[PDB]
Amino acid sequence: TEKLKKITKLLHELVDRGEIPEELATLATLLLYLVEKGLISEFDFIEHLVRLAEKLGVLEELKKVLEEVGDEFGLTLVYAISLLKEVEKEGDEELKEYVKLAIETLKEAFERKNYALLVSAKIIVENAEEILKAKKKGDEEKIKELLQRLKAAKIGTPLVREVVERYREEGEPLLDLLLHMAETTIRESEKLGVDPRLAAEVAREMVDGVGHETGETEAAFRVRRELDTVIL
Amino acid sequence: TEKLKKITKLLHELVDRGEIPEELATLATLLLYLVEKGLISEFDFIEHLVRLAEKLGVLEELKKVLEEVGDEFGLTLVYAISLLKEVEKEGDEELKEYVKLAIETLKEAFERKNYALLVSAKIIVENAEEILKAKKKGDEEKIKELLQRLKAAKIGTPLVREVVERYREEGEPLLDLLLHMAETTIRESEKLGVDPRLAAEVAREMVDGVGHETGETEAAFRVRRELDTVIL
Amino acid sequence: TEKLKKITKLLHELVDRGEIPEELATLATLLLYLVEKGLISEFDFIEHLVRLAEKLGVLEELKKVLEEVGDEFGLTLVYAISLLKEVEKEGDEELKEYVKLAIETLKEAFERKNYALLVSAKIIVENAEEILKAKKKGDEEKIKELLQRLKAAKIGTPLVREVVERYREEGEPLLDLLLHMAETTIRESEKLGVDPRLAAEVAREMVDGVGHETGETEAAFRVRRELDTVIL
Amino acid sequence: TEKLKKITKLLHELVDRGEIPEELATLATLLLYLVEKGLISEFDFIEHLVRLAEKLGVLEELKKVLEEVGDEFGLTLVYAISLLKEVEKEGDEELKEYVKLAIETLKEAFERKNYALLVSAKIIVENAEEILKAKKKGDEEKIKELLQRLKAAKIGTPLVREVVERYREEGEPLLDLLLHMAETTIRESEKLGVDPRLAAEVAREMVDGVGHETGETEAAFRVRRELDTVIL
Ligand SMILES: [Zn+2]
Ligand SMILES: [Zn+2]
Ligand SMILES: [Zn+2]
Ligand SMILES: [Zn+2]
Ligand SMILES: [Zn+2]
Ligand SMILES: [Zn+2]
Ligand SMILES: [Zn+2]
Ligand SMILES: [Zn+2]
């Protein structure tokens, strides 16, 4: 709960010298008590903080605080909420589904700080953000490529969740499950008309995330090398 | 943090039976959590309490609570804030500087409950209060005498801070440093045209404060006797 | 300080038999006392020596001395200073920034003889020197390629500094950090319009430097192989 | 020799960024070698530094360096040299003798860092400086008083030197020698027409200096009390 304590401290400091109003600091204090009292989760803390920041239009200061404390989960949640609000302003359904899946995966990661679902959600949100940028830019090829990447991410997310879950206790050989997950992702992605290229790089990023989360990167390195040979 | 807990308890009790409004009690609770969570200092607690009391015009009840709990640091801070507000209403610069120095010394004392800077700040604030009383009374001799006392206090405050700091770890003989500080205060005060009288009593009060803070009063007693011989 | 002692000895010998004047040898003696007295750093020694050599126009003899003693840090500093002077004569801003970054990295390396920042500074200075040669030659394609290499070096320099710092005490698996740094360098370099080619070779040289500095080249060898597969 | 090393370091730093010229730093280096080689004394070091500073008109920077390092002997020597130069410009013989005695006592103190002769020299130089200020001010009473103080200092200086020397090894009871020295100073001073007042305060300052140097201030405190009773 050190990140939450630092966030509360920095929000006080900010509210002490002008900047954000007092309501956000009071909410930070109450939620910091409730968490570590064992009555809510960090996801509810961050969600309430982001909702109040959006209500008061002070989200930039909250972003700066989350960068200063050095939190990736909360920052990704902030980006997800802002992107969802912007898409709701736009009103496009496929990005609605994409961001809802990203938020659900973010919540599941927040439950236990599982880095792989964090990687998946990060991929989804950054590709969606690039989609919105290209919407005003007007480069259709790039938006189609980003939709291909997002389809690959949607296909892979249950697969990476399952791979991590099985490796947790079942005891298989990570590299074998990593290779099977990557091949399944490629096959299912090409079953949707998407090249076996950019989906390959999506699977590569997710393999890197699995290696980081599982604490074993040599197997992730080997699967990365085989995928690099495959794209050739 | 027992004083803070008692202050919070008494503020509840007061807000329960009419008297002060609820906002002050809620702030007391939040700050009592933040302190003893290790995120702010007692100075911020008291400063916020006094600011809200001034905003709601209920400062007298806060004064009564601080007397009931038996706190001198908080009470001195309350007097300093009220005197600063009154002087700001008046608009006189020298008392502005005097009260700002008093508040800074009060903060430094609050950092570790250092009794000597508390004595210095108490001297400054009481002489300033007497100055404001004599302003409406109209006795110029007394106001000049109080300005002399305040100049002596300003000269002595860095000296007493340094004496306490050196005695803390360096290991000199308190009485020697006390005598040197008193003589330096007298010399610098008479360099500003002020008698070697009332400045002598200011140095005597500060020597008493140093003796109380350092836990050794026999050396303070001896320096008091030598200063009493000096004023003769 | 053996290199400094040898430099002082060789400068005496040179000044004994004509060649350089006496002022440089006297400065060498004084700075050799000050260093190893613990009052200045080797960077100040070399900087003063180079400044005097430039003032007296005897820089070639200092270069020969630095080659004879077998010092790479001092020689790179000499090249950096000469290149900065030549660019100041030319008056081009981007190479100004490039050489200033190179000099700052050289100072940081000199602080503890960190080989990786030495590699980065060497890359920057040699590409800048090639830029100046092509300026009078007049081959625009080569100058654009060298600017691409310098942009890659600028992007990578904080990354390599951070990788070395983290590996020093944090305890990660070098190869993983090396791969992440290389991929980040490639992505950021292609975000600036630069191919993923020559930037790949820049990252390869920096990976080799990291392997040399960290005392572990097998991981550097593996990352080199993966980057060689990537460029395919 | 830590003070000398710090002085040399700070002089380099100053000469590095403009300010003082290089000759002073080179002299500092050479003298810092000679001292701690065991070939000259700190008095020669400071005297050469002050002479060069006066020659180059950079004495203020040397004063700042000596304050930063925290040296009282060197600073007093600087004041003595500057005051001697100013008096030589004026051309008055009695202050010539006064400052020459002060400089000789300063050298004797520098020989072994004897604090009592430092106090005596400090008294002489500050009273002489006040004499020069009053010369342009034109207050004859003050100049006569300062001459009385200087006569008391001249009378007392051999006495304090002898008292310290005897207490060093002979083994008498300091307080007895302190009282005898003070009484002899008062008697000899009143034999020259000077009140038994300001000479009493001169003897009091010298007694304080003896107490500081000898490492025993309780006897100095007692003699101070008896002298305070005497002036009554
Ligand atoms: Zn606050
Ligand atoms: Zn299998
Ligand atoms: Zn109640
Ligand atoms: Zn003393
Ligand atoms: Zn020779
Ligand atoms: Zn990794
Ligand atoms: Zn230098
Ligand atoms: Zn006797």
Q: According to the 3-state scheme, what is the secondary structure of A191-230?
A: CCCCCCCHHHHHHHHHHHHHHHHHCCCHHHHHHHHHHHHH
A205 C-alpha to ligand 6 centroid (Å): 9
d(CA C40, CA D217): 42
Do residues B66 and B4 touch, judged by C-beta distance below 8 A? no
Q: Touching B: which chains, 3+ CB pairs < 8 A?
A: A, D
**Residue C147 neighbours by CB under 8 Å, 6+ apart:** C94, C131
Interface contacts A/C by beta carbons within 8 Å: 17
In angstroms, the CA D135 to CA D59 distance is: 23
Would you state the structure tokens that stand for residue B144, as one six-digit string? Answer: 């000049």
C162: three-class secondary structure by DSSP: helix
Burial class (CB in 10 A: 0-12, 13-18, 19+), A125: buried
Place of tokens 């002085």: D7
Contact D12 C39 (CB under 8 A): yes
CB within 8 Å of C184: residues ≥ 6 apart: C159
**Chain A residue with the nearest C-alpha to that of C183:** A205
* DSSP helix/strand/coil, D192: coil
In sequence order, what are the residues at sequence separation of 6 or more whose Cβ sits closer than 8 angstroms to the Cβ of residue B82? B54, B59
Q: How far is C114 from chain A (nearest CA, A)?
A: 27
What secondary structure, in 3-state letters, does chain A show? CHHHHHHHHHHHHHHHCCCCCHHHHHHHHHHHHHCCCCCCCHHHHHHHHHHHHHHHCCHHHHHHHHHHHCCHHHHHHHHHHHHHHHHHHHCCHHHHHHHHHHHHHHHHHHHHCCHHHHHHHHHHHHHHHHHHHHHHHCCHHHHHHHHHHHHHHHHHHHHHHHHHHHHHHCCCCHHHHHHHHHHHHHHHHHCCCCCCCHHHHHHHHHHHHHHHHHCCCHHHHHHHHHHHHHHC
At what resolution in Å was this solved? 3.4
CB atoms < 10 A from the CB of D96, how many? 14
CA distance D115 to D96: 23
Instruction: Give me ligand 2 centre to Cα A167, in Å.
Output: 14
Residue D57, CA distances (Å) to C117, D18, D20, D21, D24 in order: 44, 15, 9, 11, 11
Q: What is the C-alpha separation between B74 and B72, in angstroms, rounded?
A: 6
Closest-CA residue to D49 (of D39, D61, D67): D61
Please indicate whether chains A and C are in contact, defined as at least 3 beta carbon pairs under 8 Å: yes
Nearest CB among B173, B226, B232 relative to D217 is that of B173
Contact (CB, 8 A) for D229 and B232? no
Task: Look up residue B150 and give its amino acid.
Answer: L
What is the residue whose two structure tokens read 């039976």?
A: B17
In sequence order, what are the residues at sequence separation of 6 or more whose Cβ sits closer than 8 angstroms to the Cβ of residue C81? C47, C50, C51, C54, C103
Q: CA angle at residue A218 from A217 to A221, to 5 degrees?
A: 85
Cβ neighbours of C43 (radius 10 Å) = 18
- The Å distance, Cα B179 to ligand 4 centre, comes to 7
CA–CA gap between residue B168 and residue C206 (Å, rounded): 53
Given the structure tokens 């509210």, which residue do they identify? A15
Contact, B61 vs B14, CB < 8 A?
A: yes
Contact between A202 and A122 (Cβ < 8 Å): no
Question: D224 and B226 in contact by Cβ < 8 A?
Answer: yes
| Angle, helices D2-16/D22-34, rounded to nearest 10 degrees | 160
Q: Which residues of B touch A12 (CB under 8 A)?
A: 34, 39-40
Q: Please, which residues have CB within 8 angstroms of residue A157's CB and are 6 or more apart in sequence?
A: A101, A105, A117, A120
Q: Please count the other Cβ atoms lying within 10 Å of the Cβ belonging to residue A90.
A: 11
Cα angle value D179/D182/D186 (rounded, 5°): 140
Best mutation site among B34, B44, B45, B47 for testing chain A: the one with the most A CBs within 10 Å?
A: B34
Residues sharing a CB contact under 8 Å with residue B109, sequence separation 6 or more, in sequence order: B73, B115, B116, B117, B118, B121
**Helix, strand, or coil here: C173?**
coil
Residue D168, both tokens: 């060093």
The single-letter code of the amino acid at C187 is: R
d(CA C54, CA C198): 34
- Give the tokens for residue C96: 């100004």
Contact C34 D16 (CB under 8 A): no
How many CB atoms neighbour CB B126 within 10 A? 15
CA separation for the pair C13, C227 (Å, rounded): 48
Residues in chain D closer than 8 A to C33 (CB atoms) = 29, 33
DSSP state of C171: -
SS (H, E, C) chain B: CHHHHHHHHHHHHHHHCCCCCHHHHHHHHHHHHHCCCCCCCHHHHHHHHHHHHHHHCCHHHHHHHHHHHCCHHHHHHHHHHHHHHHHHHHCCHHHHHHHHHHHHHHHHHHHHCCHHHHHHHHHHHHHHHHHHHHHHHCCHHHHHHHHHHHHHHHHHHHHHHHHHHHHHHCCCCHHHHHHHHHHHHHHHHHCCCCCCCHHHHHHHHHHHHHHHHHCCCHHHHHHHHHHHHHHC
Distance of CA C111 to the CA centre of its chain: 13
Residues with a beta carbon under 5 angstroms from ion ligand 2 = A 176
D34 touches chain B (CB under 8 A): no
Task: Judge contact between C153 and C205, C-beta under 8 A.
Answer: no
Q: Long-range contact list for D134-141, CB < 8 A, 24+ apart?
A: D135/D90
Residues whose CB is less than 8 angstroms from the CB of residue A217 and which lie 6 or more positions away in sequence, other chains included:
A211, C173, C175, C176
Element (H, E) at C72: helix C72-90
Q: Which residues contact D180 (CB under 8 A, 6 or more apart)?
A: none
- Spell out which residues of chain B touch residue A8, defining contact as CB-CB under 8 Å: 34, 39
Distance (Å) from CA B177 to ligand 4 centroid: 7
Cα B135 to Cα B116: distance, rounded to the nearest angstrom: 29
Whether the Cβ atoms of residue D36 and residue D1 lie closer than 8 Å to each other: yes
Burial class (CB in 10 A: 0-12, 13-18, 19+), D17: exposed
Q: Any CB–CB contact under 8 A between D3 and chain C? A: no
Residues of D in Cβ contact (< 8 Å) with B226:
221, 224-225, 228
Where b means 16+ CB within 10 Å and e means fewer, B188-208 reads: bbeeeebeeebbbebbbbbbb
Residue of B183, B176, B130, B121 whose CA lies nearest to B153: B121
What is d(CA C46, CA A13) in angstroms, rounded to the nearest whole number? 46
Residues near ion ligand 6 (CB < 5 Å) are A 212; C 176
* B141, two tokens: 């001799």
Contact flag for B and C (3+ C-beta pairs < 8 Å): no
What would the two tokens of residue A211 be?
Answer: 């290696």
B212–D contact, CB cutoff 8 A:
no
Tell me, what DSSP letter sits at residue C42? H
CA distances from C85 to B166, C89, C149 (A): 52, 6, 22
Q: Is D4 exposed, middle or buried (CB count within 10 Å of its CB: 0-12, 13-18, 19+)?
A: buried
Q: CB–CB of B40 and A12 under 8 A?
A: yes
Token representation of residue D184: 């002899």
D205: helix, coil or strand?
helix
Type of residue numbered A202: V
Q: Which long-range contacts (CB under 8 A, 24 or more apart) does B140-146 make?
A: B145/B198
DSSP state of C46: H
CB C62 within 8 A of CB C53: yes
Question: What is the rounded distance in angstroms from the CA atom of residue A32 to the CA atom of residue D104?
Answer: 71
A215 vs C: CB within 8 A: no
What is the C-alpha to C-alpha distance for residues D60 and D38, in angstroms, rounded to an integer? 29
Residue A52 C-alpha, separation from nearest chain B C-alpha, in angstroms: 19
Structure-block tokens of residue D112: 């072994």
Structure tokens at C163: 């990788």
**Selection from A141, A6, A156, A2 nearest residue A68 by Cα:** A6
**Measured distance CA(A190)–CA(A210) in Å, rounded:** 22
- Widest CA span of chain A, in angstroms? 58
Residues 6+ apart with CB under 8 A from B17: none
Nearest C-alpha neighbor of A118 from the set A79, A72, A85: A72
The Cα–Cα gap between D59 and D62 comes to 5
Contact C192, C151 (CB under 8 A): yes
Q: Which residues contact D51 (CB under 8 A, 6 or more apart)?
A: D81
Grouping H, G, I as helix, E, B as strand and the rest as coil, residue C41 is coil
Contacts of C175 in chain A (CB under 8 A): 217, 221
Ligand 1 centroid – CA A13 distance (Å): 6
Q: A108: CA distance to ligand 6 center in Å?
A: 21
Strand, coil or helix: D123: helix
Residues in chain A closer than 8 A to C173 (CB atoms): 217
In angstroms, the CA C4 to CA C19 distance is 20
Report d(CA C48, CA D155) in Å as an integer: 54
**CA–CA dist A68, A56 (Å, integer):** 21
Does the beta carbon of A94 lie under 8 angstroms from any beta carbon of chain C?
A: no
How many angstroms separate the CA atoms of A161 and A183, rounded? Answer: 15
Q: What is the CA angle D201-D202-D204, rounded to 5?
A: 60
Q: What is the distance in A from the centroid of ligand 3 to the CA of B17?
A: 8
Q: Is there a contact between D9 and C39 if contact means CB atoms under 8 Å apart?
A: yes
